[PDB]
Structures are given as structure tokens and as C-alpha cells.
């Protein structure tokens, strides 16, 4: 049980490390009964149960993961170049002395050669914050494309929206290839109503439904090349459930575009309950190049205001 060693090294009052089925795992429980389960050595956060209702067991599950297969399910961080750079399962904790009981934070760290991709999973009493930060060490600027693919579950198949991506343009674009996929990038654009290529369209719906196949990316990086005003897309939006009365807000920091993916009717090909949505911030069309030695940051924050 190496997680026992990590617990007596960095375990705190609200941080509990566990090891079962040879999976190193950690649970973060802040004062208000909000739980957060993270699988160590993989940079894959599985379950997130924040206190939504004011009952005793009012906390509800947010991230869609299947029962026995933690490999396919939950929010996960992703890096490509054009292949998955962080496919190595070499993540290790760095520090946890974060706050008293109110908010907790785990600092995973790996190394893909010249890149020190360190990674922060922070629990505040209403929010997950999944925050990547990389740093070059070699004498080559890298052309990586990062992303943080979250998989939010909805109780009702019809109760699905995002509520606030209007006004900003989008292109239907496949997702980034993840080790924690639910649909492949080739089938996410298949069996529709958006056309596969990067055709651009201004959104004219204050809350875009997630009933159909349409899996797209909001942002105009062609105008980002202008580095004028360029109409920066909204850095936050209200994803709603509407089967049960709650919602969430996905705040992006550092990332440039926002990917959304609706499985449509083909969620029955994988799962039988809790129809989900694959939403995450990315820098996918125009990659990010840091330097031959600088650092770059990017974070995604799910927060609720029901409490």
C-alpha cells in the first residue's frame, strides 16, 4: 500500500488516500460534505459529489463514469503534439498543505521528457478546479495541444443545455484523442447536424440543445491570429440538468476555445443510464507554443451556485 506512505507523508484532515484493486486513489472531503474522488498515477478525476441540496445526503454525482471501467469515464487532462504525449502513467503527488479544512488541493506531476506537466486538482466547497501547467526544459519550442475533457452526466436525456455560448462563433470539429474517451473522434462527427469540417457559424441560440449529434468547438482562432479585439468567446457558461434542479458553470482560464460534444442517440451504444455530455476547454485549432524554457497554464473550473 504505497498510498499509505503517501498518506503519512501528505495526508491531511480532509484528504484520504486509498489503494484497492491496485489503483492508487484519493478522496478529498471538504467541510461541507463535498467529496471528490481522484485516481492517482493517471491524472483522471472520476467522481465529484458536491453538496447541491441542503439535505444530509444532498450531494449529487456530476461526472459520468461507468461502473467498473474507470479508464473510460470522468474528467481527464489530455496533451497531444500529433499523438498523446502524457499516455505514460507516471503522475506523482508533490504537495497537499493547501488550507485548513475548507479547500484541498493535490499536485500531481509527471515528465514526458523536456516537459514537466504538473497538474492541480483543487476542491473548493462548491467547485472542482482542474488546472494544468507545463514547463519547457529543452532547447526546442513544442507545438502541443492541451485539453481537459469533462464528462457531465444528466439524469434526463432531454434536459441538456449549456446556456451562454451564444454570440460567439463555432466550428464543428472532432474532439481531441483522449485515453479516457467515451466516443471516438471519428464517430463524434458521424451519424447526425453540423458538417464535419471547420465551417464557421455564429450561434443564435441562448441555450444550445444537446439532443442531436452536433459536437463542436466555440471560438474563432482565425481571428485570434489577428490579435485585435477578435471577440474573445465567453469564458463561462451555465450547463443545466433540468431533470433534477441544479446546474454548473465551467470557467476556463488560459484556454482559448470551448469544445462541446453531444452523444445524441448513440449514447445507447455505450451506456444505458445517465446520458452525458463531453465538454471541455482546449487550444486545439491553433496550438500553443510556450518557449525553449518558459511555462504555460490552463485550467477548467466546474462550480455550482445551488449549495
Amino acid at each position: 500500500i504505497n498510498t499509505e506512505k503517501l498518506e503519512d507523508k501528505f495526508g491531511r484532515k480532509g484528504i484520504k488516500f486509498s489503494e484497492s484493486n491496485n489503483i492508487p486513489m484519493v478522496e478529498l472531503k471538504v467541510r461541507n460534505g463535498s467529496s471528490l474522488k481522484l485516481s492517482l498515477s493517471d491524472a483522471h478525476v472520476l467522481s465529484y459529489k458536491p453538496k447541491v441540496y441542503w439535505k444530509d445526503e444532498g450531494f449529487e454525482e456530476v461526472l459520468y463514469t461507468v461502473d467498473g471501467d474507470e479508464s473510460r469515464g470522468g474528467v481527464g487532462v489530455v496533451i497531444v503534439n500529433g499523438s498523446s504525449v502524457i499516455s505514460g502513467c507516471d503522475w506523482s503527488v508533490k504537495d497537499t498543505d493547501s488550507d485548513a479544512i475548507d479547500a484541498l488541493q493535490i499536485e500531481l506531476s509527471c515528465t514526458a521528457g523536456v516537459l514537466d506537466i504538473t497538474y492541480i486538482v483543487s476542491l473548493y466547497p462548491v467547485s472542482m478546479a482542474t488546472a494544468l501547467v507545463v514547463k519547457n526544459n529543452g532547447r526546442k519550442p513544442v507545438t502541443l495541444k492541451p485539453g481537459i475533457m469533462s464528462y457531465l452526466r444528466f439524469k434526463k436525456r432531454s434536459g441538456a443545455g449549456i446556456q451562454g455560448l451564444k454570440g460567439c462563433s463555432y466550428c464543428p470539429n472532432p474532439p481531441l484523442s483522449s485515453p479516457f474517451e467515451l466516443l471516438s473522434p471519428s464517430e463524434a462527427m458521424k451519424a447526425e447536424e453540423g458538417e464535419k469540417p471547420g465551417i464557421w457559424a455564429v450561434e443564435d441560440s441562448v441555450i444550445t440543445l444537446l439532443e442531436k449529434k452536433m459536437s463542436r468547438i466555440y471560438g474563432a482562432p482565425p481571428a485570434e491570429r489577428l490579435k485585435a479585439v477578435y471577440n474573445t468567446p465567453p469564458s463561462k457558461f451555465e450547463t443545466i440538468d433540468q431533470g433534477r434542479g441544479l446546474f454548473f458553470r465551467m470557467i476556463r482560464i488560459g484556454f482559448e476555445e470551448m469544445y462541446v460534444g453531444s452523444p445524441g442517440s448513440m449514447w445507447d451504444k455505450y451506456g444505458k443510464q445517465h446520458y452525458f455530455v463531453c465538454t471541455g476547454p482546449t487550444s486545439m485549432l491553433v496550438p500553443v507554443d510556450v518557449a525553449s524554457g518558459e511555462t504555460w497554464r490552463g485550467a477548467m473550473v466546474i462550480e455550482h451556485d445551488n449549495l
Binding site: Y124, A129, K166, A228, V229, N231, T232, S235, I253, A299
Partner: protein, 128 residues
Amino acid sequence: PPAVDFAFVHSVLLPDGTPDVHWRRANGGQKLRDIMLDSNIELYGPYSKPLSNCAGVGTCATCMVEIVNGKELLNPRTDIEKEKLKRKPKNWRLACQTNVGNPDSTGLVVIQQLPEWKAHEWNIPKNI
């Protein structure tokens, strides 16, 4: 084309602790409310519901926005902004009564939306 460069700093800081700037492009000067509504940025806040505001005329003090670096291309306070708000830091104008100028206009006005419910003060350099 003649493009006026808005910024529209949000009142709520990001979880990082840094403000978010959105850089809306909207062309010309007609009305800052109609610009922020046509270009879809949060002007009202909790008054964004339909009848919770006067919807452009100026009878409520709801679409107030703190504007800094904006002594260049604005209309002056039209005595509704000078009366419906009376004791404010004077960088605060009502978006639907103010006007950023005429079509042939370029500028870098930065307009912190929702000055109420904010944490920062903006430390404007003293005038004159």
C-alpha cells in the same frame, strides 16, 4: 472598417484571481446598452430578466457600468446619469444613456461591467 475596441472586464474575478477581458468588436456608436446586448455581454446582472429593468430609457439605475480610459469618445452625462446616480465615483455611466460616438470612430474604451458586486477599485490615475 471603423472599429471601437471595447474590453468589458467582468466584475467577478476568475478562480485564478485575475480579471477576464472579452474584447467585443461591435461597430460604431449608438448606445452602450444596445452594443452590450447585440454583442451579448452581461450588462444588467440579476436585472437581466425582462421586466426587471427599464430596457433603455434610463428610469432605473440598473445598467450602470464603470468606464475608465473613456474620456476620449463618449457623450457627456445627459443629466439622467447625473441624477439617477448622484453619489458615485463619476467613472460610472448608464449604458443605455451613454453613447460612444459616431460610426467613424476608433478607441480603446475599457468598461468594467457590474461595478456593484465587485472586489476591485481600479486605482484610476488622478485627473489633471
